[PDB]
Nucleic acid binder design. Structure first.
Length: 49
DNA sequence: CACGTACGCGCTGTCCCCCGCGTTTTAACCGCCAAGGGGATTACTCCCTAGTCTCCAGGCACGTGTCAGATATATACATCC
């Protein structure tokens, strides 16, 4: 995730695109909600109906 | 209180079955429709039925006299020594 994982201040991201599923959005909303995302792309949005 | 003996308890063997562990499966759990019925409230209307009241009469309780079945004698006929 981070270019500097051994730091303790502000950690900037290393990856560009994160592919994930619904189950790990619900499971890891704490570890993923505290990320300033620039874009969301939700495939099969009828699940989000 | 005396006697005596049966059984509670301790010890030992033995075998068997339950526990611990590793591996594989599998269904509980969480998150989803898809519509529809059950049920909890809020408000309203209506009507049947149970409380209340008055009056009376017979059911229940008590007491007492009798009465038919069960029990205990009174006297007469049959019978043993």
């Amino acid at each position: 995730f981070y270019t500097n994982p051994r730091a303790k201040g502000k950690k900037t991201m290393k990856f560009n695109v994160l592919l994930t599923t619904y189950e790990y959005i619900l499971k890891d909303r704490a570890e993923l909600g505290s990320i300033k995302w620039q874009f969301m792309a939700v495939d099969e949005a009828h699940r989000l109906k």
